[PDB]
Paper text:
Production of metallo-β-lactamases (MBLs), which hydrolyze carbapenems, is a cause of carbapenem resistance in Enterobacteriaceae. The genes encoding MBLs, including IMP, NDM, and VIM types, have become widely prevalent via bacterium-specific transferable genetic apparatuses such as plasmids. We report here that sulfamoyl heteroarylcarboxylic acids (SHCs) can competitively inhibit the globally spreading and clinically relevant MBLs (i.e., IMP-, NDM-, and VIM-type MBLs) at nanomolar to micromolar orders of magnitude. X-ray crystallographic analyses revealed the inhibition mode of SHCs against MBLs; the sulfamoyl group of SHCs coordinated to two zinc ions, and the carboxylate group coordinated to one zinc ion and bound to positively charged amino acids Lys224/Arg228 conserved in MBLs.
The modes of interaction between SFC and NDM-1/VIM-2 were also determined. The key aspects for binding through the sulfamoyl and carboxylate groups in NDM-1–SFC and VIM-2–SFC structures were quite similar to those determined for the IMP-1–SFC structure. The sulfamoyl group coordinates to Zn1 and Zn2, the carboxylate oxygen O1 coordinates to Zn2, and the other carboxylate oxygen O2 binds to Asn233 and Lys224 (NDM-1)/Arg228 (VIM-2). Of note, there was no corresponding stabilization caused by Trp64 in the L3 loop of IMP-1, which holds SFC in the active site, in both NDM-1–SFC and VIM-2–SFC structures. Such structural differences in the L3 loop may cause differences in SFC affinity; the Ki values determined for inhibition of NDM-1 and VIM-2 by SFC were 9.82 μM and 2.81 μM, respectively, which are >10-fold higher than that of IMP-1 (0.22 μM). Although the inhibitory activities of SFC differed with individual MBLs, SFC bound to MBLs via their common architectures, through Zn1, Zn2, and Asn233, and through positively charged basic residue Lys224 or Arg228 of the L10 loop.
Numbering used by the authors:
A (entry chain A): 25 to 29, 40 to 270
B (entry chain B): 40 to 270
Write the structure that this text describes.
Amino acid sequence: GSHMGETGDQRFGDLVFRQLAPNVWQHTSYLDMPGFGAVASNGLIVRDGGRVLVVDTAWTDDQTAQILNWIKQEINLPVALAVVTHAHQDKMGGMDALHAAGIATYANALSNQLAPQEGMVAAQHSLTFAANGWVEPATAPNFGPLKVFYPGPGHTSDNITVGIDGTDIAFGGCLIKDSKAKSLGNLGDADTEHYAASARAFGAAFPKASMIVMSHSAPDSRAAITHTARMADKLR
Amino acid sequence: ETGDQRFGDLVFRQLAPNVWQHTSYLDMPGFGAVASNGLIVRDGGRVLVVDTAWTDDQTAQILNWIKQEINLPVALAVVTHAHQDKMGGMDALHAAGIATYANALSNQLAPQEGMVAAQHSLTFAANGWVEPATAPNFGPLKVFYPGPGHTSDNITVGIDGTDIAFGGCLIKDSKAKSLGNLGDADTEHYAASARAFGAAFPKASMIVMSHSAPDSRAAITHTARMADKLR
Ligand SMILES: Cc1oc(C)c(S(N)(=O)=O)c1C(=O)O
Ligand SMILES: Cc1oc(C)c(S(N)(=O)=O)c1C(=O)O
Ligand SMILES: [Zn+2]
Ligand SMILES: [Zn+2]
Ligand SMILES: [Zn+2]
Ligand SMILES: [Zn+2]
Ligand SMILES: [Zn+2]
Ligand SMILES: [Zn+2]
């Protein structure tokens, strides 16, 4: 089962949406984490010609259905696919809303294999990766601007990252924490030996991205990557 | 030991008409000699190897025993994760012109683990089975990724047309008190991965593993019961 058991910001139900680029938005949803209260989780929405592509669900099915409603209102293009960046509640908790809506879903093969143990619904389709971390293109059909990179084990063994081609943006998901972070967040499923190398591999994979989007903080500069790697260095 | 054969530092045990276990040893601080096992499979007119020995020299001894005892070409080797017992001899396989295969993740981890990457990467479906285009002409070798356990990258191999499945370092002996080296292990998912190996090869009666002699299926259920205690 699951381990879980302001300017420019647009409120839409209990979610928040922020435009990051002409064709890119950040979605934000909240879940109350006993003791510490509201935990934000961010993902992305990308307009690619006549299609919308989603990175990560919200925490819940009901929140994820609200992402689809927001897309209908603000973009009014069909959602061609969603890719989720590992098998934890914040990234995959809303899979049923996507499947209910007939949306094709993608995850790391390992995320799909771990999903039952992690209390998640598996995506319909599985990404695989080359030894250099880049997605095998046959497993990323019509991903368009989404450039998927497996950096190595870090936050989880299955964590993947996504560059948005033709923009300044790369999405570190839960691997990367912001440059102000006092900790690496939830290390319950982390690989402490390989985390630092995986963070640095993400930086090297998207060497010119200037806006680093993350699950649990607002977008940051590239300093988030180096600061995260140096915090991870101390886990070894 | 009666019936076992020696070549240099290597010991070979015939498990089935076309299958041998190779065993090599390394002195580990405060542990004395640690055995590591792999497999040699005769597949008609060619030989397939599962896992290197600890070192290049030991791995060359495997290849020269194969020449002496079997006298068929070695077509390919599959190595079952990026640790020295399984991939320490990659340079000897490459020098001998043997095609090498490992989990893509093993190849990605190899530099950090001080190992040499294989020439080819295996990838796996969500159900754990190797994507067939990545494992061309593997003959009787059936490669399964059971999930993270002993390491994130550990893979397993069934030998079609035999009683044998190879758990590598994921599976420990049915009398074991411990799961051996957990330094790189996934404590949450280990038990499920061990059970997934059992379910992938449900008819295998001889379970070969890295650090103990062949056992029955009891090794799978005992490993899972030990791993349940890690959670
Ligand atoms: C801060 C935080 O809360 C949760 C619930 C997670 S995760 N993605 O590990 O579940 C994290 C994280 O660090 O990613
Ligand atoms: C007993 C043992 O010794 C070593 C050196 C290893 S491994 N494969 O983790 O390096 C193991 C193991 O448990 O696999
Ligand atoms: Zn997570
Ligand atoms: Zn997270
Ligand atoms: Zn977990
Ligand atoms: Zn090992
Ligand atoms: Zn081992
Ligand atoms: Zn290691």
